[PDB]
Coordinates of C-alpha atoms and ligand atoms in Angstrom, one line a residue:
Chain A
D1 CA 104.4 67.8 108.5
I2 CA 100.7 67.7 107.3
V3 CA 98.3 65.9 109.7
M4 CA 94.9 66.7 111.1
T5 CA 93.1 64.5 113.6
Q6 CA 91.3 66.9 116.0
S7 CA 91.5 64.1 118.6
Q8 CA 88.2 62.7 117.4
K9 CA 86.3 61.4 114.4
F10 CA 82.7 61.6 115.7
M11 CA 80.9 62.9 118.8
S12 CA 77.5 62.3 120.2
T13 CA 75.1 64.6 122.2
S14 CA 71.6 63.5 123.2
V15 CA 69.6 66.5 124.3
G16 CA 70.3 70.1 125.4
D17 CA 74.1 69.6 126.0
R18 CA 76.3 72.1 124.1
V19 CA 78.4 70.8 121.2
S20 CA 82.0 71.8 120.9
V21 CA 84.7 70.4 118.5
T22 CA 88.4 71.2 118.3
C23 CA 90.6 71.4 115.2
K24 CA 94.0 70.6 116.7
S25 CA 96.5 71.0 113.8
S26 CA 100.1 70.2 113.2
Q27 CA 103.2 72.2 114.3
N28 CA 103.2 76.0 114.0
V29 CA 102.6 77.0 110.4
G30 CA 100.1 79.8 111.0
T31 CA 96.7 80.7 112.3
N32 CA 94.0 80.4 109.6
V33 CA 91.2 77.8 109.6
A34 CA 87.5 77.4 108.7
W35 CA 84.6 75.0 109.6
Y36 CA 82.0 73.7 107.1
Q37 CA 78.8 71.8 107.6
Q38 CA 78.3 68.9 105.2
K39 CA 74.6 67.8 104.9
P40 CA 74.1 64.2 103.7
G41 CA 73.6 64.8 100.0
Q42 CA 74.2 68.4 99.0
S43 CA 77.1 70.9 98.9
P44 CA 79.0 71.8 102.1
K45 CA 77.8 74.9 104.0
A46 CA 80.4 77.1 105.7
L47 CA 79.9 77.2 109.5
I48 CA 82.6 79.4 110.9
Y49 CA 85.5 81.5 109.5
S50 CA 88.9 81.3 111.3
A51 CA 87.0 79.8 114.2
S52 CA 85.9 83.2 115.6
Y53 CA 83.9 85.5 113.3
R54 CA 80.4 85.9 112.0
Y55 CA 78.5 85.2 108.8
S56 CA 76.0 87.7 107.3
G57 CA 73.9 85.0 105.6
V58 CA 73.8 82.5 108.5
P59 CA 71.9 83.0 111.8
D60 CA 75.2 82.9 113.8
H61 CA 74.9 82.1 117.5
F62 CA 78.3 80.5 118.0
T63 CA 81.2 80.5 120.4
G64 CA 84.8 80.3 119.1
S65 CA 88.3 80.2 120.5
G66 CA 91.5 82.2 120.6
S67 CA 94.6 82.0 118.4
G68 CA 97.8 79.9 118.1
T69 CA 98.3 76.3 116.9
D70 CA 95.1 75.1 118.5
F71 CA 91.5 75.8 117.5
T72 CA 88.0 75.2 119.0
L73 CA 84.4 75.8 118.0
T74 CA 81.3 75.8 120.1
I75 CA 77.8 75.7 118.6
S76 CA 74.6 76.8 120.3
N77 CA 72.8 73.5 120.9
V78 CA 71.6 70.3 119.2
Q79 CA 68.6 71.5 117.1
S80 CA 66.6 69.3 114.7
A81 CA 68.8 70.2 111.7
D82 CA 72.2 69.6 113.2
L83 CA 72.8 66.0 112.0
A84 CA 75.6 66.5 109.5
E85 CA 79.4 66.2 109.0
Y86 CA 81.9 68.7 110.4
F87 CA 84.9 69.7 108.2
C88 CA 87.8 71.8 109.4
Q89 CA 90.1 73.8 107.1
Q90 CA 93.8 74.7 107.0
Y91 CA 95.1 77.1 104.3
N92 CA 98.8 78.0 104.9
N93 CA 100.8 76.1 102.2
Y94 CA 99.7 75.5 98.6
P95 CA 99.1 71.7 99.1
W96 CA 95.9 72.1 101.0
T97 CA 94.9 69.1 103.1
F98 CA 92.0 68.9 105.6
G99 CA 91.2 66.4 108.4
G100 CA 89.2 63.3 108.6
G101 CA 86.0 65.2 109.6
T102 CA 83.7 65.1 112.6
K103 CA 80.3 63.6 112.7
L104 CA 77.5 64.7 115.1
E105 CA 75.0 62.1 116.2
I106 CA 71.9 62.6 118.3
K107 CA 72.1 59.8 120.9
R108 CA 68.5 58.7 121.1
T109 CA 67.6 56.8 124.3
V110 CA 65.2 53.9 125.0
Chain B
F347 CA 113.8 110.2 81.5
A348 CA 112.4 108.3 84.5
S349 CA 110.1 105.4 84.8
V350 CA 106.3 105.8 84.4
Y351 CA 105.5 104.8 88.0
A352 CA 108.4 106.9 89.3
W353 CA 107.4 109.8 87.1
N354 CA 109.9 112.7 87.0
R355 CA 108.7 115.9 88.6
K356 CA 110.2 119.3 87.8
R357 CA 109.3 122.7 89.3
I358 CA 109.9 125.8 87.1
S359 CA 109.5 129.4 88.3
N360 CA 111.2 132.8 88.2
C361 CA 111.8 132.8 84.4
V362 CA 110.4 134.1 81.1
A363 CA 110.1 131.6 78.3
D364 CA 108.0 131.4 75.1
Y365 CA 105.4 128.6 75.1
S366 CA 104.4 129.3 71.5
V367 CA 107.5 127.7 70.0
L368 CA 106.4 124.3 71.3
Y369 CA 103.3 123.6 69.2
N370 CA 104.8 125.7 66.3
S371 CA 107.2 122.9 65.5
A372 CA 105.9 119.9 63.6
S373 CA 107.9 117.3 65.6
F374 CA 105.3 117.2 68.4
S375 CA 103.0 114.3 67.5
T376 CA 100.3 114.7 70.2
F377 CA 99.2 117.9 71.9
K378 CA 96.1 117.7 74.0
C379 CA 95.9 120.9 76.0
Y380 CA 92.7 121.1 78.1
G381 CA 93.5 124.1 80.4
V382 CA 93.6 126.8 77.8
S383 CA 93.8 127.3 74.0
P384 CA 97.4 126.8 72.7
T385 CA 97.7 130.4 71.4
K386 CA 96.7 131.8 74.8
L387 CA 99.7 130.4 76.8
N388 CA 101.8 133.5 76.2
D389 CA 98.9 135.9 76.8
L390 CA 98.3 134.8 80.4
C391 CA 100.7 134.7 83.4
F392 CA 101.0 131.8 85.8
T393 CA 102.9 130.7 88.9
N394 CA 105.2 127.8 90.0
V395 CA 104.7 125.7 86.9
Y396 CA 105.0 121.9 87.4
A397 CA 106.1 119.4 84.8
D398 CA 105.6 115.6 85.0
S399 CA 107.5 113.5 82.5
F400 CA 107.5 109.8 81.8
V401 CA 107.5 107.2 79.0
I402 CA 104.5 105.2 77.9
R403 CA 103.8 102.7 75.1
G404 CA 102.5 103.6 71.7
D405 CA 98.7 102.9 72.1
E406 CA 98.1 104.4 75.6
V407 CA 98.2 108.1 74.8
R408 CA 94.4 108.2 75.3
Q409 CA 94.9 106.9 78.9
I410 CA 96.5 110.2 80.0
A411 CA 93.4 112.4 80.4
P412 CA 91.4 113.7 83.3
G413 CA 88.7 111.2 84.5
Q414 CA 89.0 108.1 82.3
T415 CA 89.9 104.4 82.6
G416 CA 93.2 102.6 81.9
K417 CA 95.6 100.2 83.7
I418 CA 98.3 102.9 83.6
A419 CA 95.7 105.5 84.4
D420 CA 94.7 103.5 87.5
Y421 CA 97.9 102.0 89.0
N422 CA 100.6 104.2 87.5
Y423 CA 99.4 107.8 87.1
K424 CA 95.9 109.3 87.3
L425 CA 94.6 112.8 86.5
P426 CA 91.9 114.3 88.7
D427 CA 88.8 115.6 87.0
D428 CA 89.4 119.2 88.1
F429 CA 92.7 119.5 86.3
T430 CA 93.2 122.5 84.1
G431 CA 96.5 121.2 82.6
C432 CA 98.1 120.6 79.3
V433 CA 99.6 117.5 77.7
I434 CA 102.3 116.9 75.1
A435 CA 103.5 113.5 73.8
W436 CA 106.0 112.6 71.1
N437 CA 107.6 109.5 69.6
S438 CA 111.1 108.4 70.7
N439 CA 111.4 105.2 68.6
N440 CA 114.9 106.1 67.4
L441 CA 116.0 106.6 71.0
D442 CA 115.3 103.1 72.2
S443 CA 116.2 100.9 69.2
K444 CA 118.4 97.7 69.8
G447 CA 115.3 96.6 72.4
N448 CA 115.2 98.6 75.6
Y449 CA 114.6 96.4 78.7
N450 CA 115.1 98.9 81.6
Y451 CA 111.5 100.2 81.9
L452 CA 109.2 99.2 84.8
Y453 CA 105.6 99.8 85.3
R454 CA 103.1 98.9 88.1
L455 CA 100.5 96.3 87.1
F456 CA 99.0 95.2 90.4
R457 CA 97.7 97.5 93.2
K458 CA 95.1 97.3 95.9
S459 CA 93.2 100.3 94.6
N460 CA 93.4 103.3 92.2
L461 CA 96.2 105.8 92.7
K462 CA 95.5 109.2 94.3
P463 CA 95.9 112.4 92.2
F464 CA 99.6 113.4 91.7
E465 CA 100.7 110.6 94.0
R466 CA 104.4 109.7 93.9
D467 CA 103.8 106.1 95.1
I468 CA 107.2 104.5 95.3
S469 CA 107.5 101.1 97.1
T470 CA 108.1 97.4 96.4
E471 CA 106.1 94.4 97.7
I472 CA 105.0 91.0 96.6
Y473 CA 101.4 91.4 95.4
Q474 CA 99.0 88.8 96.8
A475 CA 95.6 88.0 95.3
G476 CA 94.8 84.8 97.2
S477 CA 93.1 83.7 100.4
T478 CA 96.2 82.1 101.8
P479 CA 98.8 84.6 103.2
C480 CA 101.8 85.4 101.0
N481 CA 105.3 85.1 102.5
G482 CA 108.8 84.0 101.6
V483 CA 109.4 83.3 97.9
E484 CA 107.1 84.3 95.1
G485 CA 104.6 81.8 93.7
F486 CA 100.9 81.3 93.2
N487 CA 99.0 84.5 94.3
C488 CA 102.5 86.0 94.9
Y489 CA 103.6 88.2 92.0
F490 CA 105.9 91.0 91.2
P491 CA 103.9 94.1 90.2
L492 CA 106.7 95.5 88.0
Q493 CA 107.2 94.3 84.4
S494 CA 109.4 95.2 81.5
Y495 CA 108.4 96.6 78.0
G496 CA 108.7 94.8 74.7
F497 CA 110.3 97.7 72.8
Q498 CA 111.7 95.7 69.9
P499 CA 113.3 97.7 67.1
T500 CA 111.0 96.0 64.5
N501 CA 107.6 97.1 66.0
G502 CA 105.0 99.5 64.8
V503 CA 102.4 101.6 66.6
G504 CA 101.6 100.4 70.1
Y505 CA 105.1 99.3 70.9
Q506 CA 107.1 102.4 70.0
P507 CA 108.1 104.4 73.2
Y508 CA 106.4 107.7 73.6
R509 CA 107.7 110.5 75.8
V510 CA 104.8 112.1 77.6
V511 CA 105.0 115.4 79.5
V512 CA 102.1 117.1 81.5
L513 CA 102.2 120.7 82.5
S514 CA 100.2 122.0 85.5
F515 CA 100.1 125.3 87.3
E516 CA 98.5 127.4 90.0
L517 CA 97.1 130.8 89.0
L518 CA 98.2 133.8 91.2
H519 CA 98.3 132.3 94.7
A520 CA 99.8 135.6 95.8
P521 CA 103.0 136.6 93.8
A522 CA 103.7 136.3 90.1
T523 CA 106.9 134.9 88.7
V524 CA 106.5 133.4 85.3
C525 CA 104.5 135.2 82.5
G526 CA 104.5 135.3 78.8
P527 CA 107.1 137.3 76.8
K528 CA 106.5 140.8 75.7
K529 CA 107.7 142.4 72.5
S530 CA 108.7 146.1 71.9
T531 CA 108.8 148.1 68.7
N532 CA 111.0 151.0 67.6
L533 CA 110.6 154.6 68.7
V534 CA 109.5 157.8 66.8
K535 CA 110.1 161.4 67.6
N536 CA 108.5 164.8 66.8
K537 CA 105.1 163.3 66.2
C538 CA 102.1 163.2 68.5
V539 CA 102.0 159.5 69.5
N540 CA 100.1 157.5 72.1
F541 CA 102.7 155.5 74.0
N542 CA 102.7 152.6 76.5
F543 CA 106.1 152.7 78.1
Chain C
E1 CA 74.2 86.7 92.4
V2 CA 76.7 83.9 92.4
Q3 CA 75.6 80.6 90.8
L4 CA 77.3 77.4 89.5
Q5 CA 75.9 74.9 87.1
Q6 CA 77.7 71.6 86.6
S7 CA 77.3 68.4 84.6
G8 CA 75.4 65.3 85.7
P9 CA 76.6 61.9 86.7
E10 CA 79.1 60.1 84.4
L11 CA 80.3 56.5 83.9
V12 CA 83.9 56.1 83.0
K13 CA 86.2 53.2 81.8
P14 CA 89.6 52.3 83.3
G15 CA 92.5 53.6 81.2
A16 CA 90.4 56.2 79.4
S17 CA 90.1 60.0 79.3
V18 CA 86.9 62.0 80.3
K19 CA 86.0 65.6 80.7
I20 CA 84.1 67.5 83.4
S21 CA 83.0 71.1 83.1
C22 CA 82.4 73.7 85.8
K23 CA 80.3 76.7 84.5
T24 CA 80.4 80.1 86.1
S25 CA 78.0 82.9 85.1
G26 CA 76.4 86.0 86.5
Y27 CA 79.6 87.4 88.0
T28 CA 83.1 88.5 87.1
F29 CA 85.5 85.6 86.4
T30 CA 88.9 87.3 85.9
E31 CA 90.0 88.1 89.5
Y32 CA 89.1 85.2 91.8
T33 CA 90.8 81.8 91.4
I34 CA 88.9 78.5 91.0
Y35 CA 89.4 75.5 93.2
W36 CA 88.7 71.8 92.6
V37 CA 88.2 69.2 95.4
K38 CA 86.9 65.7 95.7
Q39 CA 84.6 63.7 98.0
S40 CA 84.8 59.9 97.9
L41 CA 81.4 59.1 99.3
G42 CA 81.6 60.9 102.6
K43 CA 85.3 60.3 103.3
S44 CA 87.9 62.9 104.0
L45 CA 88.0 65.9 101.6
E46 CA 91.0 66.1 99.2
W47 CA 92.1 69.4 97.6
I48 CA 92.5 68.4 94.0
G49 CA 94.0 71.7 93.0
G50 CA 93.4 75.2 91.8
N51 CA 93.9 77.6 88.9
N52 CA 94.1 81.3 88.3
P53 CA 91.8 82.7 85.5
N54 CA 94.0 85.8 84.9
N55 CA 97.6 84.5 85.0
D56 CA 96.5 81.0 83.8
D57 CA 98.4 79.6 86.8
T58 CA 98.0 75.9 87.9
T59 CA 98.6 74.4 91.3
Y60 CA 98.3 70.8 92.5
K61 CA 98.5 68.9 95.8
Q62 CA 101.4 66.8 96.9
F63 CA 100.2 63.7 95.2
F64 CA 98.1 64.3 92.1
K65 CA 100.2 62.9 89.2
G66 CA 98.2 60.9 86.7
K67 CA 95.5 63.4 85.8
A68 CA 97.2 66.7 86.6
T69 CA 95.6 69.0 84.1
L70 CA 93.7 72.3 84.3
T71 CA 91.9 74.5 81.7
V72 CA 89.7 77.5 81.6
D73 CA 88.1 79.7 78.9
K74 CA 86.5 83.2 79.0
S75 CA 84.3 83.0 75.9
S76 CA 82.4 80.2 77.6
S77 CA 83.5 81.5 81.0
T78 CA 83.9 78.0 82.3
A79 CA 86.6 75.4 83.3
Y80 CA 87.3 71.9 81.9
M81 CA 89.0 69.1 83.8
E82 CA 90.5 66.1 82.0
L83 CA 90.5 62.8 83.9
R84 CA 92.9 60.0 82.9
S85 CA 93.9 56.6 84.5
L86 CA 90.5 55.9 86.0
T87 CA 91.9 52.6 87.4
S88 CA 90.0 51.3 90.4
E89 CA 89.0 53.9 93.0
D90 CA 88.4 57.3 91.3
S91 CA 84.6 56.9 91.5
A92 CA 83.7 60.0 93.6
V93 CA 82.2 63.5 93.3
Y94 CA 84.0 66.6 92.1
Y95 CA 83.3 70.0 93.6
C96 CA 84.2 73.3 92.0
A97 CA 84.4 76.3 94.2
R98 CA 85.3 80.0 94.0
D99 CA 87.0 82.1 96.7
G100 CA 86.8 85.8 97.5
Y101 CA 89.8 88.0 98.1
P102 CA 88.1 91.2 99.5
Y103 CA 86.0 89.0 101.9
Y104 CA 85.0 85.4 102.7
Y105 CA 88.2 83.5 102.2
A106 CA 88.4 79.7 102.0
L107 CA 86.0 78.6 99.4
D108 CA 82.9 80.7 100.2
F109 CA 80.8 79.4 97.3
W110 CA 80.4 75.8 96.3
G111 CA 78.8 73.8 93.5
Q112 CA 76.5 70.8 93.3
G113 CA 79.3 68.5 92.2
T114 CA 79.6 65.9 89.5
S115 CA 79.6 62.2 90.4
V116 CA 81.8 59.9 88.3
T117 CA 81.7 56.1 88.6
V118 CA 84.2 53.7 87.3
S119 CA 83.0 50.4 85.7
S120 CA 83.9 47.9 83.1
Chain D
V159 CA 121.9 126.6 111.5
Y160 CA 122.2 124.4 108.5
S161 CA 119.6 121.8 109.4
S162 CA 117.2 121.3 106.5
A163 CA 116.7 122.3 102.8
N164 CA 113.0 121.2 102.3
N165 CA 110.8 123.2 99.9
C166 CA 113.2 125.8 98.7
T167 CA 110.7 127.8 96.8
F168 CA 113.1 130.7 96.1
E169 CA 116.8 131.4 95.8
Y170 CA 118.7 134.6 95.1
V171 CA 122.4 135.3 94.5
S172 CA 123.8 138.8 94.2
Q173 CA 126.7 141.0 95.2
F186 CA 136.2 157.5 111.8
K187 CA 134.7 154.1 111.3
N188 CA 132.0 153.7 108.7
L189 CA 128.5 152.8 109.9
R190 CA 125.9 151.1 107.6
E191 CA 122.2 151.6 107.9
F192 CA 119.3 149.3 106.8
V193 CA 115.5 149.4 106.7
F194 CA 113.4 146.3 106.3
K195 CA 109.8 146.5 105.3
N196 CA 107.1 144.1 104.0
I197 CA 104.0 145.2 102.2
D198 CA 101.4 142.8 100.6
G199 CA 104.0 140.0 100.3
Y200 CA 106.7 142.3 98.9
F201 CA 109.9 142.6 100.9
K202 CA 111.9 145.8 100.6
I203 CA 115.4 146.4 101.9
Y204 CA 116.7 150.0 101.8
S205 CA 120.4 150.6 102.5
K206 CA 123.0 153.3 103.2
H207 CA 126.7 152.8 103.1
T208 CA 128.2 155.9 104.9
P209 CA 126.4 159.0 106.1
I210 CA 127.8 162.4 107.2
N211 CA 129.8 162.0 110.4
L212 CA 129.5 164.6 113.1
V213 CA 130.8 163.0 116.3
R214 CA 131.7 159.4 117.4
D215 CA 129.7 156.7 119.1
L216 CA 126.3 158.4 118.3
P217 CA 124.2 158.7 115.1
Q218 CA 124.3 162.4 114.2
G219 CA 123.8 163.8 110.7
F220 CA 121.2 163.5 107.9
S221 CA 121.1 161.3 104.9
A222 CA 118.3 159.7 102.9
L223 CA 118.1 156.0 102.2
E224 CA 117.9 154.6 98.6
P225 CA 116.3 151.2 97.8
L226 CA 118.5 148.1 97.2
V227 CA 116.3 145.1 96.2
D228 CA 112.7 144.0 96.0
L229 CA 111.7 140.4 96.7
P230 CA 108.3 138.6 95.9
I231 CA 108.4 136.3 99.0
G232 CA 104.9 136.2 100.3
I233 CA 105.5 135.4 103.9
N234 CA 104.0 136.9 107.1
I235 CA 107.4 137.3 108.9
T236 CA 106.8 138.0 112.6
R237 CA 110.1 137.7 114.4
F238 CA 113.7 138.2 113.4
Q239 CA 117.3 137.8 114.8
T240 CA 120.8 138.7 113.9
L241 CA 123.8 136.5 113.2
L242 CA 127.4 136.9 114.3
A243 CA 130.8 135.4 113.2
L244 CA 131.9 134.2 116.6
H245 CA 135.3 132.6 117.3
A264 CA 126.3 146.7 118.8
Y265 CA 123.3 147.3 116.5
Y266 CA 120.6 149.9 117.3
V267 CA 117.1 148.7 116.6
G268 CA 114.2 151.1 115.9
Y269 CA 110.6 150.8 114.8
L270 CA 108.3 152.3 112.2
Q271 CA 105.0 154.1 112.7
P272 CA 102.5 155.6 110.3
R273 CA 103.7 159.2 110.2
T274 CA 103.5 162.1 107.8
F275 CA 106.6 164.0 106.6
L276 CA 107.4 167.0 104.5
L277 CA 110.4 166.5 102.2
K278 CA 112.4 169.1 100.4
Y279 CA 113.8 167.6 97.2
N280 CA 117.1 169.1 95.9
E281 CA 117.6 170.4 92.4
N282 CA 119.3 167.2 91.3
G283 CA 116.5 165.0 92.7
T284 CA 118.1 164.1 96.1
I285 CA 116.4 164.6 99.4
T286 CA 118.2 167.0 101.7
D287 CA 115.6 168.2 104.3
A288 CA 112.8 166.6 106.1
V289 CA 110.3 168.0 108.6
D290 CA 107.9 166.1 110.8
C291 CA 104.2 166.9 110.9
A292 CA 103.2 165.8 114.4
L293 CA 106.1 166.7 116.7
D294 CA 106.0 170.4 117.6
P295 CA 103.5 173.3 117.0
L296 CA 106.1 175.1 114.9
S297 CA 106.6 171.8 112.9
Ligands
LIG1 C1 123.9 168.5 90.6 O1 124.6 167.7 89.7 C2 125.5 168.4 88.8 C3 126.1 167.4 87.8 O2 127.0 166.5 88.5 C4 126.6 169.2 89.6 O3 127.4 169.9 88.7 C5 128.8 169.7 88.9 O4 129.2 170.2 90.2 C6 130.6 170.0 90.5 C7 130.8 170.5 91.9 O5 129.7 170.6 92.6 C8 131.5 170.6 89.4 O6 132.8 170.3 89.7 C9 131.1 170.1 88.0 O7 131.8 170.8 87.0 C10 129.6 170.3 87.8 N1 129.2 169.8 86.5 C11 128.3 170.3 85.7 C12 128.0 169.6 84.4 O8 127.7 171.4 86.0 C13 125.9 170.0 90.6 O9 126.9 170.6 91.5 C14 124.9 169.3 91.5 N2 124.3 170.1 92.4 C15 124.0 169.8 93.7 C16 123.3 170.8 94.5 O10 124.2 168.7 94.1
NAG2 C1 106.8 120.6 101.3 O1 105.6 120.9 102.0 C2 104.6 119.9 101.8 C3 103.4 120.4 102.5 O2 103.0 121.7 102.1 C4 105.1 118.5 102.4 O3 104.1 117.6 102.1 C5 106.4 118.2 101.7 O4 106.9 117.0 102.2 C6 107.4 119.3 101.8 N1 108.7 119.0 101.1 C7 109.7 118.3 101.6 C8 110.9 118.1 100.7 O5 109.7 117.9 102.8
NAG3 C1 99.7 134.5 107.0 O1 99.1 133.5 107.6 C2 97.7 133.4 107.3 C3 97.1 132.3 108.1 O2 96.3 132.9 109.2 C4 97.6 133.0 105.8 O3 96.2 133.0 105.4 C5 98.3 134.1 105.0 O4 98.3 133.7 103.6 C6 99.7 134.3 105.5 N1 100.4 135.4 104.7 C7 101.2 135.2 103.7 C8 101.8 136.4 103.1 O5 101.5 134.1 103.3

């Protein structure tokens, strides 16, 4: 029916390692998604369109995925302004419903 | 007549008819004739005349003109700026009294229509981010609507028959010209003749 | 040239009716629809609904009954939401967004949001 | 033959063994067809005799017309050509043409 879990709720990368998050969706309804960045306190900022395109107003250095019922997004690296929430989108039927979101944490060491 | 979006097109050639009798009658409410003065129609000769006929509402007669705005002038019928044509329009209120609910007109389109474009097609117009499929709904509309031509309505709801005449001048042959009149004859007098 | 000014924080009472306004200015309002979503303090995003400025259409989600009401006006070029039955858990932030049909689908532009808190 | 009827810009409806003669010409978009029903017969199987040709119709077509072909009702037609010549014609007293002499054939001519 309508369910979105993307197999994870939060992921952690310490230093240098590339960050990638999937947006596994429900059964086949279509191919149209989006990804937004949610900074802690202000309005969400759109990250990717349909998981593979570019934004004019964003310094886009991103890697996406193909098509079908599964989606994936790869970001450049873990910069100093990456600590935020990750929201995926699904717009096929009128009752729009998104997933639980993904949280990126910078795993600091001792 | 035909619908406004499926406007009726007629091609007339190889005949001689008087164009003066049209504007002479007082039954023609609107006559806006940009190509040439009304009295010069019979004077000049043309070729392969084309007539486009349709029906519009009462208060849209100003929409039918070369190079202006209007919903009908954008999605139903548009005149190019370089158009040396002629336009007639007259009331037909008594011909649609109860009222008439068989008239359709385009309301939604991606862009403005091309000049003299006979765009006939049907599709569910979409205006939303989500794709449109299946049954109509939000951001899924029918671009054709009826007319409220009630028999108890004034100006703006009375049906108007609108015809537009266009032509090409002497491409190579000449078929349709204005009528010519001839007087009587005289004899046994030095006369200058034009036989 | 797109901007959106909303109202500040609000305190509501259970079993009452309140109003929240989303203001749009500086750009045309007739074509693109307006969407309403909620954030319950960092939880999952819920699509409250949407409305069409031109056709005056209204669309809700699967479960929205209780405060399902939409309203817009062109003289003020804004939208008004009515909230009812503020029982126990509606304290959250509302976000008003606008989409683009020619380009940038899926809520390109967002707003600052209005935070409503329920208390006795 | 009947395959299409697109862009019909013109349409016209009108009306010893005898031999019929025709001449087809096109000048500045005007099509001329001259006809002759039955000329003077001298002998069989060959075109002897003299007779002038009178015009039949005039059509404002406006085509270039490069090739042509004949049609037959299945279950001989001599074909000539025209060249820019000069002729001397002796009109009769009733207006008809009875004698013609070429100008570039023989020194006597
Ligand atoms: C020129 O035309 C006139 C008029 O038809 C011809 O005169 C007739 O000739 C026939 C015999 O040739 C006579 O039977 C008629 O009585 C004549 N009618 C008149 C009014 O004269 C004349 O023959 C023609 N000439 C030529 C050389 O063709
Ligand atoms: C007549 O010719 C025009 C091009 O000159 C073409 O667009 C049109 O389709 C033709 N008419 C028909 C009935 O095919
Ligand atoms: C013959 O063809 C040429 C094209 O090279 C055209 O310009 C001309 O008008 C044609 N002639 C007629 C009589 O249509």
